[PDB]
């Protein structure tokens, strides 16, 4: 509260570390469904159904231009990528499996880096 603060957590490496994690996700073999925005002209249903599209390229541009105020807003966009994937894709599809694998991969790097 006013003039009463928890001790200051060092957040000065967060930007760099989120970039590293993002590099690792970009270079994973199962990243291909997620590298670029879904083409809303060519994929029936996507525009109406997925209210907040997100992809790794869009996260990378936001990261590079100071549009994440903190590491939690970064994690929200990453998870949004996988949540959208589960909304639109059957679990037993290549893309549906990719998304489960990538979420797993991300959540481990996240815990190991920050928790």
Short mmCIF file of N, CA and C in Angstrom, two decimals:
data_model
loop_
_atom_site.label_atom_id
_atom_site.label_comp_id
_atom_site.label_asym_id
_atom_site.label_seq_id
_atom_site.Cartn_x
_atom_site.Cartn_y
_atom_site.Cartn_z
N UNK A 1 0.90 -1.20 0.00
CA UNK A 1 0.00 0.00 0.00
C UNK A 1 0.91 1.22 0.00
N UNK A 2 0.34 2.41 0.18
CA UNK A 2 1.12 3.65 0.21
C UNK A 2 2.30 3.73 1.16
N UNK A 3 3.50 3.92 0.57
CA UNK A 3 4.77 3.85 1.31
C UNK A 3 5.07 2.44 1.99
N UNK A 4 4.46 1.38 1.49
CA UNK A 4 4.68 0.02 2.04
C UNK A 4 4.85 -0.93 0.89
N UNK A 5 6.12 -1.29 0.60
CA UNK A 5 6.44 -2.09 -0.59
C UNK A 5 7.12 -3.38 -0.27
N UNK A 6 6.70 -4.50 -0.89
CA UNK A 6 7.51 -5.73 -0.93
C UNK A 6 8.92 -5.43 -1.44
N UNK A 7 9.91 -6.25 -1.08
CA UNK A 7 11.27 -6.06 -1.63
C UNK A 7 11.33 -6.12 -3.19
N UNK A 8 12.17 -5.25 -3.81
CA UNK A 8 12.25 -5.13 -5.30
C UNK A 8 12.88 -6.39 -5.98
N UNK A 9 12.05 -7.28 -6.54
CA UNK A 9 12.50 -8.30 -7.55
C UNK A 9 13.26 -7.70 -8.77
N UNK A 10 14.43 -8.29 -9.08
CA UNK A 10 15.26 -7.76 -10.16
C UNK A 10 14.61 -8.19 -11.49
N UNK A 11 14.14 -7.21 -12.24
CA UNK A 11 13.42 -7.47 -13.48
C UNK A 11 14.22 -7.02 -14.69
N UNK A 12 15.49 -6.68 -14.48
CA UNK A 12 16.28 -6.00 -15.52
C UNK A 12 16.72 -6.93 -16.69
N UNK A 13 16.75 -8.23 -16.43
CA UNK A 13 17.01 -9.24 -17.45
C UNK A 13 15.77 -9.88 -18.08
N UNK A 14 14.59 -9.43 -17.72
CA UNK A 14 13.34 -10.08 -18.20
C UNK A 14 13.22 -10.00 -19.73
N UNK A 15 13.46 -8.82 -20.28
CA UNK A 15 13.39 -8.58 -21.73
C UNK A 15 14.28 -9.54 -22.51
N UNK A 16 15.52 -9.65 -22.09
CA UNK A 16 16.45 -10.57 -22.68
C UNK A 16 16.10 -12.00 -22.57
N UNK A 17 15.69 -12.40 -21.39
CA UNK A 17 15.28 -13.77 -21.18
C UNK A 17 13.95 -14.20 -21.98
N UNK A 18 12.94 -13.33 -21.99
CA UNK A 18 11.73 -13.57 -22.84
C UNK A 18 12.14 -13.71 -24.33
N UNK A 19 13.06 -12.85 -24.79
CA UNK A 19 13.63 -12.99 -26.16
C UNK A 19 14.28 -14.35 -26.42
N UNK A 20 15.05 -14.85 -25.46
CA UNK A 20 15.65 -16.15 -25.57
C UNK A 20 14.67 -17.28 -25.62
N UNK A 21 13.69 -17.25 -24.72
CA UNK A 21 12.63 -18.21 -24.75
C UNK A 21 11.89 -18.20 -26.12
N UNK A 22 11.58 -17.01 -26.61
CA UNK A 22 10.86 -16.82 -27.85
C UNK A 22 11.69 -17.38 -29.00
N UNK A 23 13.03 -17.18 -28.98
CA UNK A 23 13.95 -17.76 -29.99
C UNK A 23 13.88 -19.27 -29.98
N UNK A 24 13.83 -19.85 -28.81
CA UNK A 24 13.75 -21.27 -28.67
C UNK A 24 12.42 -21.79 -29.23
N UNK A 25 11.35 -21.06 -28.99
CA UNK A 25 10.02 -21.47 -29.51
C UNK A 25 10.00 -21.33 -31.05
N UNK A 26 10.56 -20.24 -31.58
CA UNK A 26 10.64 -20.01 -33.01
C UNK A 26 11.41 -21.09 -33.77
N UNK A 27 12.41 -21.68 -33.15
CA UNK A 27 13.28 -22.65 -33.79
C UNK A 27 12.87 -24.10 -33.49
N UNK A 28 11.84 -24.34 -32.71
CA UNK A 28 11.36 -25.69 -32.46
C UNK A 28 10.74 -26.24 -33.77
N UNK A 29 10.92 -27.53 -33.98
CA UNK A 29 10.39 -28.11 -35.22
C UNK A 29 8.91 -28.07 -35.37
N UNK A 30 8.17 -28.05 -34.29
CA UNK A 30 6.74 -27.98 -34.31
C UNK A 30 6.16 -26.53 -34.21
N UNK A 31 6.98 -25.54 -34.39
CA UNK A 31 6.55 -24.15 -34.41
C UNK A 31 5.81 -23.71 -35.69
N UNK A 32 5.92 -24.50 -36.77
CA UNK A 32 5.41 -24.07 -38.09
C UNK A 32 3.95 -23.57 -38.13
N UNK A 33 3.02 -24.15 -37.32
CA UNK A 33 1.66 -23.57 -37.40
C UNK A 33 1.54 -22.19 -36.81
N UNK A 34 2.59 -21.72 -36.11
CA UNK A 34 2.50 -20.56 -35.18
C UNK A 34 3.42 -19.43 -35.56
N UNK A 35 4.23 -19.58 -36.61
CA UNK A 35 5.27 -18.62 -36.92
C UNK A 35 4.71 -17.31 -37.46
N UNK A 36 3.62 -17.41 -38.21
CA UNK A 36 3.01 -16.25 -38.86
C UNK A 36 1.53 -16.16 -38.59
N UNK A 37 0.92 -14.96 -38.72
CA UNK A 37 -0.54 -14.86 -38.57
C UNK A 37 -1.33 -15.76 -39.53
N UNK A 38 -2.40 -16.37 -39.00
CA UNK A 38 -3.31 -17.18 -39.81
C UNK A 38 -3.90 -16.21 -40.83
N UNK A 39 -3.94 -16.66 -42.08
CA UNK A 39 -4.40 -15.82 -43.19
C UNK A 39 -5.94 -15.82 -43.16
N UNK A 40 -6.48 -14.72 -42.69
CA UNK A 40 -7.91 -14.58 -42.43
C UNK A 40 -8.74 -14.53 -43.70
N UNK A 41 -8.10 -14.29 -44.84
CA UNK A 41 -8.78 -14.40 -46.14
C UNK A 41 -8.88 -15.83 -46.60
N UNK A 42 -7.93 -16.69 -46.23
CA UNK A 42 -7.87 -18.01 -46.79
C UNK A 42 -8.34 -19.09 -45.87
N UNK A 43 -8.68 -18.78 -44.60
CA UNK A 43 -9.02 -19.84 -43.65
C UNK A 43 -10.41 -19.53 -43.17
N UNK A 44 -11.39 -20.23 -43.77
CA UNK A 44 -12.78 -20.05 -43.37
C UNK A 44 -12.98 -20.27 -41.90
N UNK A 45 -13.77 -19.42 -41.32
CA UNK A 45 -14.16 -19.59 -39.91
C UNK A 45 -13.26 -18.78 -38.95
N UNK A 46 -12.01 -18.55 -39.35
CA UNK A 46 -10.96 -18.11 -38.33
C UNK A 46 -11.25 -16.75 -37.79
N UNK A 47 -11.57 -15.86 -38.72
CA UNK A 47 -11.85 -14.48 -38.35
C UNK A 47 -12.98 -14.35 -37.34
N UNK A 48 -14.08 -15.05 -37.60
CA UNK A 48 -15.27 -14.94 -36.72
C UNK A 48 -15.11 -15.65 -35.40
N UNK A 49 -14.45 -16.80 -35.46
CA UNK A 49 -14.35 -17.64 -34.31
C UNK A 49 -13.27 -17.17 -33.34
N UNK A 50 -12.12 -16.73 -33.87
CA UNK A 50 -10.91 -16.47 -32.96
C UNK A 50 -10.85 -14.99 -32.77
N UNK A 51 -11.30 -14.56 -31.61
CA UNK A 51 -11.53 -13.14 -31.35
C UNK A 51 -10.20 -12.36 -31.18
N UNK A 52 -9.15 -13.05 -30.74
CA UNK A 52 -7.84 -12.44 -30.59
C UNK A 52 -6.75 -13.30 -31.19
N UNK A 53 -6.51 -13.16 -32.50
CA UNK A 53 -5.44 -13.96 -33.12
C UNK A 53 -4.08 -13.57 -32.57
N UNK A 54 -3.19 -14.56 -32.45
CA UNK A 54 -1.81 -14.28 -31.99
C UNK A 54 -0.91 -15.34 -32.61
N UNK A 55 0.34 -14.97 -32.81
CA UNK A 55 1.35 -15.78 -33.47
C UNK A 55 2.74 -15.31 -32.99
N UNK A 56 3.76 -16.13 -33.21
CA UNK A 56 5.12 -15.82 -32.74
C UNK A 56 5.71 -14.57 -33.35
N UNK A 57 5.46 -14.32 -34.65
CA UNK A 57 5.98 -13.11 -35.29
C UNK A 57 5.45 -11.81 -34.68
N UNK A 58 4.18 -11.83 -34.34
CA UNK A 58 3.47 -10.73 -33.76
C UNK A 58 3.98 -10.53 -32.32
N UNK A 59 4.22 -11.63 -31.62
CA UNK A 59 4.79 -11.51 -30.26
C UNK A 59 6.20 -10.93 -30.39
N UNK A 60 6.98 -11.39 -31.38
CA UNK A 60 8.36 -10.93 -31.56
C UNK A 60 8.39 -9.38 -31.86
N UNK A 61 7.54 -8.92 -32.72
CA UNK A 61 7.42 -7.49 -33.00
C UNK A 61 6.98 -6.67 -31.74
N UNK A 62 5.96 -7.16 -31.01
CA UNK A 62 5.55 -6.51 -29.76
C UNK A 62 6.75 -6.44 -28.77
N UNK A 63 7.47 -7.54 -28.62
CA UNK A 63 8.59 -7.60 -27.69
C UNK A 63 9.69 -6.54 -28.04
N UNK A 64 10.08 -6.52 -29.30
CA UNK A 64 11.07 -5.65 -29.85
C UNK A 64 10.72 -4.16 -29.83
N UNK A 65 9.47 -3.80 -29.66
CA UNK A 65 9.01 -2.43 -29.75
C UNK A 65 8.43 -1.93 -28.43
N UNK A 66 8.74 -2.63 -27.31
CA UNK A 66 8.26 -2.21 -25.98
C UNK A 66 6.82 -2.22 -25.76
N UNK A 67 6.14 -3.16 -26.38
CA UNK A 67 4.68 -3.26 -26.14
C UNK A 67 4.25 -4.28 -25.07
N UNK A 68 5.20 -4.97 -24.46
CA UNK A 68 4.90 -5.73 -23.19
C UNK A 68 5.31 -4.96 -21.93
N UNK A 69 4.32 -4.58 -21.09
CA UNK A 69 4.75 -3.85 -19.90
C UNK A 69 5.47 -4.73 -18.90
N UNK A 70 5.24 -6.04 -18.90
CA UNK A 70 5.93 -6.90 -17.94
C UNK A 70 5.91 -8.36 -18.45
N UNK A 71 6.61 -9.24 -17.76
CA UNK A 71 6.75 -10.63 -18.28
C UNK A 71 5.38 -11.39 -18.26
N UNK A 72 4.41 -11.01 -17.40
CA UNK A 72 3.11 -11.65 -17.42
C UNK A 72 2.27 -11.36 -18.67
N UNK A 73 2.37 -10.16 -19.24
CA UNK A 73 1.64 -9.85 -20.42
C UNK A 73 2.28 -10.65 -21.58
N UNK A 74 3.59 -10.86 -21.53
CA UNK A 74 4.29 -11.67 -22.57
C UNK A 74 3.73 -13.10 -22.51
N UNK A 75 3.66 -13.67 -21.31
CA UNK A 75 3.19 -15.09 -21.13
C UNK A 75 1.72 -15.25 -21.55
N UNK A 76 0.90 -14.21 -21.34
CA UNK A 76 -0.50 -14.22 -21.77
C UNK A 76 -0.63 -14.35 -23.31
N UNK A 77 0.19 -13.63 -24.05
CA UNK A 77 0.18 -13.71 -25.53
C UNK A 77 0.68 -15.06 -26.02
N UNK A 78 1.74 -15.61 -25.39
CA UNK A 78 2.22 -16.93 -25.76
C UNK A 78 1.08 -17.96 -25.55
N UNK A 79 0.49 -17.95 -24.35
CA UNK A 79 -0.57 -18.91 -24.05
C UNK A 79 -1.77 -18.70 -24.97
N UNK A 80 -2.09 -17.44 -25.33
CA UNK A 80 -3.14 -17.16 -26.29
C UNK A 80 -2.93 -17.90 -27.62
N UNK A 81 -1.68 -17.99 -28.06
CA UNK A 81 -1.34 -18.71 -29.28
C UNK A 81 -1.86 -20.22 -29.16
N UNK A 82 -1.62 -20.84 -28.01
CA UNK A 82 -1.99 -22.23 -27.83
C UNK A 82 -3.46 -22.49 -27.54
N UNK A 83 -4.06 -21.59 -26.79
CA UNK A 83 -5.48 -21.54 -26.60
C UNK A 83 -6.28 -21.36 -27.86
N UNK A 84 -5.87 -20.46 -28.74
CA UNK A 84 -6.47 -20.34 -30.07
C UNK A 84 -6.34 -21.62 -30.86
N UNK A 85 -5.16 -22.19 -30.80
CA UNK A 85 -4.90 -23.45 -31.49
C UNK A 85 -5.88 -24.56 -31.02
N UNK A 86 -6.09 -24.66 -29.72
CA UNK A 86 -7.02 -25.68 -29.19
C UNK A 86 -8.48 -25.40 -29.55
N UNK A 87 -8.85 -24.14 -29.62
CA UNK A 87 -10.18 -23.71 -30.06
C UNK A 87 -10.54 -24.13 -31.50
N UNK A 88 -9.56 -24.11 -32.39
CA UNK A 88 -9.81 -24.31 -33.78
C UNK A 88 -9.40 -25.65 -34.38
N UNK A 89 -8.62 -26.43 -33.64
CA UNK A 89 -8.01 -27.63 -34.14
C UNK A 89 -8.33 -28.81 -33.23
N UNK A 90 -8.65 -29.91 -33.87
CA UNK A 90 -8.83 -31.18 -33.15
C UNK A 90 -7.47 -31.58 -32.48
N UNK A 91 -7.57 -32.08 -31.25
CA UNK A 91 -6.39 -32.68 -30.56
C UNK A 91 -5.64 -33.73 -31.41
N UNK A 92 -6.37 -34.55 -32.15
CA UNK A 92 -5.79 -35.60 -32.99
C UNK A 92 -5.65 -35.10 -34.44
N UNK A 93 -4.81 -34.09 -34.60
CA UNK A 93 -4.43 -33.48 -35.92
C UNK A 93 -2.99 -33.12 -35.76
N UNK A 94 -2.25 -32.97 -36.84
CA UNK A 94 -0.90 -32.50 -36.68
C UNK A 94 -0.81 -31.14 -35.95
N UNK A 95 -1.67 -30.20 -36.30
CA UNK A 95 -1.57 -28.86 -35.74
C UNK A 95 -1.99 -28.92 -34.26
N UNK A 96 -3.00 -29.73 -33.95
CA UNK A 96 -3.53 -29.86 -32.56
C UNK A 96 -2.44 -30.45 -31.65
N UNK A 97 -1.71 -31.43 -32.15
CA UNK A 97 -0.56 -32.03 -31.45
C UNK A 97 0.63 -31.06 -31.29
N UNK A 98 0.91 -30.32 -32.37
CA UNK A 98 1.92 -29.26 -32.34
C UNK A 98 1.65 -28.31 -31.20
N UNK A 99 0.42 -27.87 -31.06
CA UNK A 99 0.08 -26.92 -30.06
C UNK A 99 0.24 -27.42 -28.66
N UNK A 100 -0.17 -28.67 -28.41
CA UNK A 100 0.08 -29.26 -27.08
C UNK A 100 1.53 -29.40 -26.77
N UNK A 101 2.35 -29.80 -27.76
CA UNK A 101 3.78 -29.95 -27.58
C UNK A 101 4.49 -28.60 -27.27
N UNK A 102 4.12 -27.58 -28.04
CA UNK A 102 4.70 -26.23 -27.88
C UNK A 102 4.32 -25.60 -26.52
N UNK A 103 3.12 -25.83 -26.08
CA UNK A 103 2.67 -25.29 -24.79
C UNK A 103 3.51 -25.91 -23.66
N UNK A 104 3.62 -27.25 -23.72
CA UNK A 104 4.50 -27.98 -22.82
C UNK A 104 5.92 -27.48 -22.79
N UNK A 105 6.55 -27.31 -23.96
CA UNK A 105 7.84 -26.80 -24.09
C UNK A 105 7.99 -25.40 -23.47
N UNK A 106 7.02 -24.52 -23.75
CA UNK A 106 7.04 -23.16 -23.26
C UNK A 106 6.97 -23.15 -21.72
N UNK A 107 6.05 -23.94 -21.16
CA UNK A 107 5.74 -23.85 -19.75
C UNK A 107 6.92 -24.33 -18.89
N UNK A 108 7.63 -25.35 -19.38
CA UNK A 108 8.90 -25.74 -18.77
C UNK A 108 10.00 -24.64 -18.81
N UNK A 109 10.27 -24.06 -19.98
CA UNK A 109 11.23 -22.94 -20.06
C UNK A 109 10.83 -21.80 -19.14
N UNK A 110 9.54 -21.55 -19.01
CA UNK A 110 9.02 -20.43 -18.22
C UNK A 110 9.32 -20.67 -16.70
N UNK A 111 8.92 -21.82 -16.21
CA UNK A 111 9.19 -22.28 -14.85
C UNK A 111 10.69 -22.32 -14.58
N UNK A 112 11.47 -23.00 -15.43
CA UNK A 112 12.91 -23.01 -15.23
C UNK A 112 13.60 -21.66 -15.24
N UNK A 113 13.10 -20.70 -16.04
CA UNK A 113 13.76 -19.41 -16.12
C UNK A 113 13.37 -18.45 -14.97
N UNK A 114 12.13 -18.48 -14.52
CA UNK A 114 11.54 -17.44 -13.68
C UNK A 114 11.00 -17.94 -12.29
N UNK A 115 10.78 -19.24 -12.08
CA UNK A 115 10.10 -19.75 -10.85
C UNK A 115 10.98 -20.73 -10.05
#
